[PDB]
Design an enzyme around this catalytic site. Structure first.
Site, short mmCIF file in Angstrom:
data_model
loop_
_atom_site.label_atom_id
_atom_site.label_comp_id
_atom_site.label_asym_id
_atom_site.label_seq_id
_atom_site.Cartn_x
_atom_site.Cartn_y
_atom_site.Cartn_z
N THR A 159 0.80 -1.19 0.00
CA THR A 159 0.00 0.00 0.00
C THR A 159 0.85 1.27 0.00
OG1 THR A 159 -1.89 -1.08 0.84
CG2 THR A 159 -1.81 1.26 1.15
N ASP A 691 26.89 2.39 -16.36
CA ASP A 691 28.14 2.56 -15.61
C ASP A 691 29.10 3.36 -16.47
OD1 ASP A 691 27.06 0.97 -13.49
OD2 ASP A 691 28.58 -0.65 -13.88
CA LIG Z 1 25.07 1.91 -12.83
CL LIG Z 2 32.08 5.96 -20.00
ZN LIG Z 3 -3.72 -4.92 2.15
#
Ligand SMILES: [Ca+2]
Ligand SMILES: [Cl-]
Ligand SMILES: [Zn+2]
Ligand SMILES: *[C@@H]1O[C@H](CO)[C@@H](O[C@@H]2O[C@H](CO)[C@@H](O[C@@H]3O[C@H](CO[C@H]4O[C@H](CO[C@H]5O[C@H](CO)[C@@H](O)[C@H](O)[C@@H]5O)[C@@H](O)[C@H](O[C@H]5O[C@H](CO)[C@@H](O)[C@H](O)[C@@H]5O[C@H]5O[C@H](CO)[C@@H](O)[C@H](O)[C@@H]5O)[C@@H]4O)[C@@H](O)[C@H](O[C@H]4O[C@H](CO)[C@@H](O)[C@H](O)[C@@H]4O[C@H]4O[C@H](CO)[C@@H](O)[C@H](O)[C@@H]4O)[C@@H]3O)[C@H](O)[C@H]2NC(C)=O)[C@H](O)[C@H]1NC(C)=O
Ligand SMILES: O=C(OCc1cc(Cl)cc(Cl)c1)N1C[C@H]2CNC[C@H]2C1
Ligand SMILES: [Cl-]
Ligand SMILES: [Cl-]
Ligand SMILES: [Cl-]
Length: 806
Positions: A159, A691
């Site tokens: 929730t 990266d």
């Molecule tokens: Ca990364």
């Molecule tokens: Cl790079």
């Molecule tokens: Zn619930």
């Protein structure tokens, strides 16, 4: 301390919370035990209930009454919602035919259509059909407005993570509400469902819609309601706020219902008991709409009807116990239930070992109903790793089950028949979306979309600039009549080089060999063509992907494929090829099994070398364009170029070989051709973002050749499969994946069998959106199509889920 001797007189449901120790009168004071002494008496009146009856019509105003049926009530904005119906011969909103709202029809001094978000806890997508007979108000919103067949929640399908995603546009890993229970090791503090710590601001990251509005000069209703405030009073409070003067009136409001979740837990999602909760929520909707119609706002306000998650059948007897797997059950803490999170009970115990916990929980029992993961190995589509509040050890629990530490936790810590929290692609966890109002489309069905997208749309509905978020702004433009966002494609940062033949074969010392020394004006005039890009319109169908970061790369053309080859990473960022329905699969000839060829367009110093692979005892290699799909024996030589080679663990080559040798052809056959874009992904810090080179943690031993964390493929065809993929006039269809590049197949319990019994199942678990790949690669796809940009943004957010039909 709260000095509750103050008064709520003329402050009921005041919009700005007052600073302690002064007493509060706002819609959350109950939950902080802080309300003024007279809050119940003044602000939660109940006398005479919630509906006008004929005998009250024109009554004398009596300020004790919960709501009013006196002649002045419309002026006061405090009539019972059915006042005009009972006392003035008007019809209920639901009984009126629906009529397109082509423009806002707003009372004087409204600067903009208000937005009302009607959020329902536990409202499973199939309720819209299965409960249609008892929800007439909701079914009218749905059929008259804009609706989706379902809306995908975020993981975990709990929730608070989903409500706060709705408010922020952020994945839980980014907003910080990662579960209904949490330990933050930097704060050294815990967050609990019950208690006062959860209201500490440091838990809640990002910028929710009410703060976005406020910072840009748009007032907001308070979004949270204490559980003891009845629904009829929440609706009346909204309608009263909507009668404030222009300069004080909010433009955005939320209503929350704890139902049907509350009953669903007790009775299951389709328990006979669930009819009445659905009737009651519909009645509430009817109160709101009748109330808007009385204020002459029913053709002015945009209403969103939206849920947080669904509900599945779960009982006590479907619980797995970690006590049946581990010996050391007392040295762990488990966050239990429909997901598991495991960490050490004590940081001062250096004997606890994650690798042995994982091994003890992996494929240990034939029917096992959960799968353990280090968080970085979870499917990337869950986006559930980049937060210190997410434990390194995660258990993905199968739908309909629970996991618990020990049996005593289930009977001394069956009471329940439903729950939620499972993987967000499970059908039972899907929820609902309806948009109704002047800004939404009329009687329009849109495809299923993810709840992370809604923040941007809500900002558009209110004229606000969204804070940075995980939606793709413009992907939901097709929901709107007006107020669309007109996105522009990102600029390309790096331009490619187009190298020609620049190196003699003897300049290379790569330790590679190939049996390729046997050899017209026919096909030497013609192979020159294939190396300059003559087949390029066949293999690159949607433009070159744009490189959105600073780097050095080369476009390389070939008869059967085109690539963008990175001189920094020593391998392609992408490789693009088209496989027609008619294409044939061939083998790798015996004399070519270990063939790798220098690419005379790319220097020795920006190439991979085969010696590195020979010396790396764990690492092998594969190819991005598969040799199996070569167009001819002579073209096949191109596939063994050093510039098409990528590092692959032997275990991963089992998956990759099956994909390339069996599945690509199967897909072309089913989809009438496919275009494939494949490549590497490096995400060693599990942030979902590409990266940089200095973030790479592993290289092929003795070399500068980085090892990918994952391999992707984007597979595109014509949505009208009567046209072939390479001559498609209209909308596209896509499926994509992001496979973990792992040195074992421990994730797949049936991996000692033939690939035909487990590989495709793996690939489906690792299904992905094109947008997920974009984030992970810094590439931007589909730059040159004949489609509108907004449509392309929708395609890029698509997830192929492989669930049956709802
Ligand atoms: Ca990364
Ligand atoms: Cl790079
Ligand atoms: Zn619930
Ligand atoms: C989904 O969408 C989101 C939102 O866009 C994406 O998330 C964003 O991703 C960015 C890149 O990873 C990240 O950038 C960081 O920001 C660091 C500063 O962070 C704080 O400030 C944020 C801004 O708040 C203000 O916002 C508006 C303007 O927009 C202002 O007007 C307001 O006044 C606001 O205050 C704030 O949102 C952020 O929140 C996080 O942290 C809080 C705890 O303090 C939590 O409450 C909250 O939930 C957030 O937590 C998440 O994100 C953090 C990372 O911030 C992460 O650790 C958590 O796990 C969690 O996921 C902060 O309060 C900034 O310092 C970073 O810069 C470093 O890296 C760059 C690299 O280029 C260096 O150049 C730079 O010098 C710096 O390096 C230095 O530090 C290094 C590490 O310490 C060190 O190695 C080096 O040697 C240097 O000393 C970087 O810019 C955003 O913060 C982040 N935002 C959010 C909300 O998460 C997400 O990527 C998307 N997902 C996908 C898959 O697409
Ligand atoms: O009133 C609530 O929530 C309303 C809402 C709507 C939307 Cl769309 C976004 C958000 Cl953040 C909140 N809540 C009341 C409390 C009951 N259980 C926990 C709390 C959630
Ligand atoms: Cl949780
Ligand atoms: Cl294997
Ligand atoms: Cl369903």
């Amino acid at each position: 301390w709260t000095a509750t001797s103050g008064s709520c007189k003329g402050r009921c449901f005041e919009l700005q919370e007052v600073g302690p120790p002064d007493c509060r009168c706002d819609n959350l004071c109950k939950s902080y035990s802080s309300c003024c002494h007279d809050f119940d008496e003044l602000c939660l009146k109940t006398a005479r209930g919630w509906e006008c009856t004929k005998d009250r019509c024109g009554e004398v105003r009596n300020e004790e009454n919960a709501c009013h049926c006196s002649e002045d009530c419309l002026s006061r904005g405090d009539c019972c919602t059915n006042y005009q119906v009972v006392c003035k011969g008007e019809s209920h909103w639901v009984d009126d035919d629906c009529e397109e709202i082509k423009v806002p029809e707003c009372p004087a001094g409204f600067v903009r259509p208000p937005l009302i978000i009607f959020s329902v806890d536990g409202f499973r997508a199939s309720y819209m059909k299965k409960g249609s007979k008892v929800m007439p108000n909701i079914e009218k919103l749905r059929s008259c407005g804009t609706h989706a067949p379902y809306m995908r929640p975020v993981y975990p399908t709990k929730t608070f993570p989903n409500l706060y995603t709705l408010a922020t546009g952020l994945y839980p890993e980014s907003h910080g509400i990662v579960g209904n229970s949490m330990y933050d090791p930097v704060f050294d503090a815990s967050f609990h469902l019950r208690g006062r710590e959860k209201f500490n601001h440091r838990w809640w990251g990002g910028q929710p819609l009410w703060i976005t509005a406020t910072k840009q000069g748009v007032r907001a209703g308070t979004f949270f309601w204490s559980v003891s405030i009845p629904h009829e009073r929440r609706i009346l409070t909204i309608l009263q706020w909507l009668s404030l003067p222009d300069n004080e009136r909010p433009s955005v409001y939320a209503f929350y219902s704890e139902q049907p979740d509350f009953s669903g837990h007790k009775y299951g999602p389709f328990g006979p008991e669930m009819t009445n909760p659905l009737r009651e929520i519909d009645k509430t909707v009817g109160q709101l709409m009748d109330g808007l119609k009385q204020l002459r706002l029913h053709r002015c306000v945009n209403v969103i009807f939206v849920g947080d998650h669904g509900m599945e059948d779960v009982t006590c007897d479907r619980t797995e116990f970690l006590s049946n797997y581990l010996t050391n059950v007392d040295d762990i803490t488990l966050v239990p239930g429909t997901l598991g999170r495991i960490r050490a009970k004590s940081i001062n115990n250096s004997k606890y070992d994650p690798k042995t916990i994982i091994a003890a929980l992996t494929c240990k029992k034939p029917d096992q109903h959960f799968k353990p993961y280090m968080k970085q190995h979870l499917p990337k589509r869950l986006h559930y790793a980049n937060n210190r509040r997410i434990e390194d050890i995660h258990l993905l629990v199968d739908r309909r089950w629970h996991v618990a530490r020990k049996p005593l936790d289930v009977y001394k810590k069956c009471f329940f028949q439903g729950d939620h929290g499972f993987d967000n692609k499970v059908n039972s966890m899907q929820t609902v979306f309806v948009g109704y109002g002047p800004t939404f489309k009329y009687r329009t069905k849109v495809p299923p979309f993810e709840n992370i997208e809604l923040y941007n749309v809500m900002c558009d509905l209110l004229g606000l600039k969204p804070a940075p978020n995980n939606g793709t702004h413009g992907s939901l433009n097709h929901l709107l009549r007006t107020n669309t966002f007109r996105p522009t494609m990102p600029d390309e940062v790096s331009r490619p080089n187009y190298p020609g033949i620049m190196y003699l074969q003897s300049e290379f010392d790569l330790g590679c060999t190939c049996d390729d020394k046997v050899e017209n004006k026919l096909e030497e005039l013609n192979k020159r063509l294939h190396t300059k890009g003559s087949t390029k319109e066949r293999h690159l169908l949607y433009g070159r992907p744009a490189v959105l970061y600073r780097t050095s790369y080369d476009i390389l053309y070939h008869t059967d494929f085109e690539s963008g080859y990175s001189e920094i990473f020593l391998m392609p960022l992408w490789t693009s090829y088209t496989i027609s329905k008619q294409a044939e699969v061939s083998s790798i000839p015996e004399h070519l099994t270990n063939c790798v060829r220098p690419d005379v367009r790319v220097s020795p110093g920006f190439s991979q070398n085969c010696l590195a692979y020979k010396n790396d005892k764990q690492m092998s290699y594969g190819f991005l364009f598969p040799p199996y799909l070569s167009s001819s024996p002579e073209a096949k030589y191109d596939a063994f170029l050093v510039t098409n080679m990528v590092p692959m663990y032997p275990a991963f080559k089992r998956v990759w070989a099956y994909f390339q040798r069996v599945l690509v052809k199967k897909y072309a056959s089913e989809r009438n051709g496919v275009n494939v874009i494949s490549g590497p992904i490096f995400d060693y810090n599990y942030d979902g973002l590409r990266d940089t080179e200095d973030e790479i943690k592993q290289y092929v031993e003795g070399s500068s050749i980085p090892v990918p964390t994952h391999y992707y493929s984007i597979i595109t065809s014509c949505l009208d499969f009567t046209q072939p993929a390479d001559k498609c006039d209209g909308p596209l269809s896509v499926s994509s994946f992001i496979l973990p590049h792992r040195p074992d197949n421990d994730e797949s319990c049936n991996s000692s069998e033939d690939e035909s019994k487990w590989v495709e199942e793996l690939m489906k678990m690792h299904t992905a959106r094109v947008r997920d790949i974009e984030h992970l690669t810094g590439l931007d796809f589909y730059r040159k199509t004949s489609r509108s940009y907004s449509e392309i943004l929708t395609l890029k957010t698509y997830l192929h889920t492989y669930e049956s039909e709802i």
